[PDB]
Amino acid sequence: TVPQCCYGFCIDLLIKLARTMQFTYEVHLVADGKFGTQERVQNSNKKEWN
């Protein structure tokens, strides 16, 4: 888990969002590539968006 930089267009859109109603942007990285889709595991009968 390393630091990085946040540079992006839509990222800046978020910046503008906080610029409307104030919230301090804390940008994590994305552990995985995607957002998620509820999908069953090898067990548990639970569709998990990972």
Place this chain on the structure above:
Amino acid sequence: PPSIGIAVILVGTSDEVAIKDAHEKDDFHHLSVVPRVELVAMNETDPKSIITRICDLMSDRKIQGVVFADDTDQEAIAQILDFISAQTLTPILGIHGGSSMIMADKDESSMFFQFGPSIEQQASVMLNIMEEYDWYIFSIVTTYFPGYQDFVNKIRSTIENSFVGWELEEVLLLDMSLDDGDSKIQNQLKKLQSPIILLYCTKEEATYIFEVANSVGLTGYGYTWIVPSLVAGDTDTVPSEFPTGLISVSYDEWDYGLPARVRDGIAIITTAASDMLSEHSFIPEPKSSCYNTHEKRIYQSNMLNRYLINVTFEGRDLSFSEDGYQMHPKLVIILLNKERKWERVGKWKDKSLQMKYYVWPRMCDHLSIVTLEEAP
């Protein structure tokens, strides 16, 4: 390398001669410890008596395991047998009848064992046969007996995550403790048009239930309810509830020798002994007495189960699951015959089934076709 004591329960008319012979005969140079064998049998099976002479069994000699063979198929006494078992916290495996039967996920202190796949895993091989049968459409129905939502999620997710086009519609929940005076079994359940149906209930409850199924004429050519193992119960006892050509599977019984798999069982006890001398190199002391529960209470810390995980011998894999399901189990598909007798519908093992009939046999508009593949 010490003599390993174990016990074998016997209830009902059976051949213990070759059982005792092989018990002395069965041995492995890969077995570091020798067995200590004392045979046992009883007419009265009640844990009053059964658990009585079981406490007397831990009391007299040291027998580290109990092979339970029962006269009847009612397994309640086998479950409570697991209860007294964990009470003793000694190893045990039901070898026959309801003793080898599966009950739900006992307390963390229960080392009771059995030979076969999980009833869940059973249903798995079941729908697997639904693949062997090439019958796309299917549906489920069941009463309020336990594992209801368990098998429900098992199947729903089972075929759900699949890439196959196996067809399904809905399942029918019921409660057979009470009944429907309006025959909501018949009245409501008649709405099921699925080309294949699933029957899961208690054989007793399945008597009146499947009687209502007769009242629904669900036996029609093409119309059938596939069924479970213990629900089907003994292939010997023929209920009128089961329709002609009843579609169900179970653990190997008619073909598989029960005392043979019993030799397999004690052999598996000796396998736990093998890995036990391998790793722990020590075996716990025997349980003194049932009243001695005060004395031996603090004496139970069991990695034997933690060792019992991987078990295999004589080319067979004796490992149960964390839920006790045999690692590489084997089961038998069966169906009532034209003689009104359950006839083998297949052998379920390795997630594979040998099937004699090239199709699900139907006799009672099926129309052949053939061509060659030429696009378009």
Place this chain on the structure above:
Amino acid sequence: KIVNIGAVLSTRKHEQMFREAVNQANKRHGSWKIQLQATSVTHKPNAIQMALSVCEDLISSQVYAILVSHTPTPVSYTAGFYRIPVLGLTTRMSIYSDKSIHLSFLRTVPPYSHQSSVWFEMMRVYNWNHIILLVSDDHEGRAAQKRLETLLEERESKGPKAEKVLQFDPGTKNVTALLMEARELEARVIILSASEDDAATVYRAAAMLDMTGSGYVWLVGEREISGNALRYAPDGIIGLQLINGKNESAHISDAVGVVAQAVHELLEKENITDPPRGCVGNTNIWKTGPLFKRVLMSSKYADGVTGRVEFNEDGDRKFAQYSIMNLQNRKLVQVGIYNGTHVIPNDRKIIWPGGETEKPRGYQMSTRLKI
């Protein structure tokens, strides 16, 4: 005739007063065609010989029904071995409420899991539109947590909508995950779920969490809270308990109450199937015993010695009164009650965890925005 009645308890004196209950019952119900018969043995630590006495006394007597009170009652699992009527009393553990393990367990006491419903009443109490659930990791504990979901899942009709819960293995050293999520948690509403030692590590970490002041609400039952748990217990803690929680004698009284209620319903039965005498080697169960269980099921008594009460479809009781309590100057103090739907506050004010008793808004936005 005289109806043999067994009971499982600690001592034979309360059993003597229990035979007195057999007398008051033989007077209560119609005694013409039947009478009360009281013979019983206490609960010994080893359940083996306890079951030996179970079959010995009861099965040989082939009684109509038996009683039990405080792993326990595996011999009542043996009452399932005959599937015969037998009475539980002291159970706050819903493991005893398992339909598989216990086919039919008839008792007049709710399990501690029902304290979830209590926690929903608390949802009406603290009125927090946010919630969270603190729980140890167990199987039965997990089940109770599922019931807690049901309480939340009850809101799905058209709510507090607890953010998250987590499991904590028995005697877990580092709760830093739990308290961690607490730091992560913006709302102040947390639903504590624990057993005794579980509660010990709980409050211990809560101090270690330094969340013990106002701004952290972790609610649970005396079953978690009471006892040596109260020693390390958190500050200003408040909770409730089922009315007449620890009282065994009254449990014996009303126990006889619904018991003789089951004598009238048994008298209300017909084509009586005798309780089986033969036990060892007995492969069958009389159809009466379970039909008697359904009898107790259809039976709803007007009142017991515990008063007018309700029961569940699982057979557990219902309508029961959770008596609101609170920790006052490191000492427990009863703060009120909640019973059917009715939460009765007492004249004592409801103390918040900090010095102030007032209820602020626990859910608060974190300006730092994790994305």
